[PDB]
Amino acid sequence: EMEKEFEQIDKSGSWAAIYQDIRHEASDFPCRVAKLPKNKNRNRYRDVSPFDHSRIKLHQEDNDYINASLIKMEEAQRSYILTQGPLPNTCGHFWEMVWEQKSRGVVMLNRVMEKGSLKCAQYWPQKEEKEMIFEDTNLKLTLISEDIKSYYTVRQLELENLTTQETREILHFHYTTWPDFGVPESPASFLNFLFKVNESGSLSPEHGPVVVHCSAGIGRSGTYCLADTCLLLMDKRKDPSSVDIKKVLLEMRKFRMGLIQTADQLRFSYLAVIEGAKF
Numbered sequence: 001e002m003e004k005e006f007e008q009i010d011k012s013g014s015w016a017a018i019y020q021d022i023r024h025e026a027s028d029f030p031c032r033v034a035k036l037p038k039n040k041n042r043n044r045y046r047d048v049s050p051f052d053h054s055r056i057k058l059h060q061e062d063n064d065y066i067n068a069s070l071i072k073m074e075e076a077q078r079s080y081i082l083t084q085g086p087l088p089n090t091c092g093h094f095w096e097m098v099w100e101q102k103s104r105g106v107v108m109l110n111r112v113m114e115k116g117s118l119k120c121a122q123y124w125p126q127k128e129e130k131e132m133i134f135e136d137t138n139l140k141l142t143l144i145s146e147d148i149k150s151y152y153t154v155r156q157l158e159l160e161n162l163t164t165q166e167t168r169e170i171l172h173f174h175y176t177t178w179p180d181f182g183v184p185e186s187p188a189s190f191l192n193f194l195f196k197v198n199e200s201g202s203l204s205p206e207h208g209p210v211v212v213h214c215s216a217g218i219g220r221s222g223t224y225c226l227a228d229t230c231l232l233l234m235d236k237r238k239d240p241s242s243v244d245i246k247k248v249l250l251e252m253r254k255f256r257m258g259l260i261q262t263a264d265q266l267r268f269s270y271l272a273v274i275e276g277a278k279f
């Protein structure tokens, strides 16, 4: 039933037109805090900002700002923190947000360098013996182990609040073959990765929201979250065929701008939802 619409859009070739409709209809809320002069160096892209109403606030006293938004999908009963790839000066902020929000999983959908440009700082340690200290936010981060698969990596990190010596296990779910402004190589590989995240226990109701990021926290991250939310809704509605992926995406865009950055990412989200609804 959802693939009938999909086949019609494909036959008509109207993915670009459907996508531009969504861009035209999407919410426009203020981002005054993100645009304050004092926050210029905390934003990776001048055209990608969190709305004031949904931005994550840091709890230490001098500047509360991070480029991160809480997406609260009330009907699907899931919230996500979508954020940009941290900058070299915001890695301490990133881990402070992870600590304060009680998240236990971080989903990374990009590589640190893509097409020869830096897209995200090296915000976690690559070597067990070379831990990272974030002196500004009083946190230490140690690589405990990595489970490296052919197209993604799952890392066990230990995040320690150096003030209290409390430690927490953070799982890092790193999708390494998703090109910027592009799509996964198959719905099956995307779905197997999504299922690994969802079965990991990182998304339990006793924990804070999962953190999802790409370079900007909108294109790949929006594609991931739209598919995950729509699959939750289909497993949750009495009538699963009533799930309208365009309506869901517009709902998500009330909480962060620009979610899904190409018409092919929109097409892929439909495809992943169709394939996953079967499995």
Ligand SMILES: O=C(O)C(=O)Nc1sc2c(c1C(=O)O)CCNC2
Pocket (backbone or CB within 6 Å): 045, 047, 048, 110, 119, 180, 181, 214, 215, 216, 217, 218, 219, 220, 221, 261
């Ligand atoms: O990383 C993503 O999937 C993503 O949305 N990236 C985005 S969105 C976006 C940019 C990028 C980028 O990576 O260059 C450049 C500035 N315009 C908006």
Ligand SMILES: [Cl-]
Pocket (backbone or CB within 6 Å): 036, 037, 038, 039
């Ligand atoms: Cl200012």
Ligand SMILES: [Cl-]
Pocket (backbone or CB within 6 Å): 058, 060, 062, 063, 064, 065, 093
């Ligand atoms: Cl700060």
Ligand SMILES: [Cl-]
Pocket (backbone or CB within 6 Å): 110, 111, 112, 113
């Ligand atoms: Cl990388």
Ligand SMILES: [Cl-]
Pocket (backbone or CB within 6 Å): 023, 257, 258, 259, 260, 261
């Ligand atoms: Cl957009």
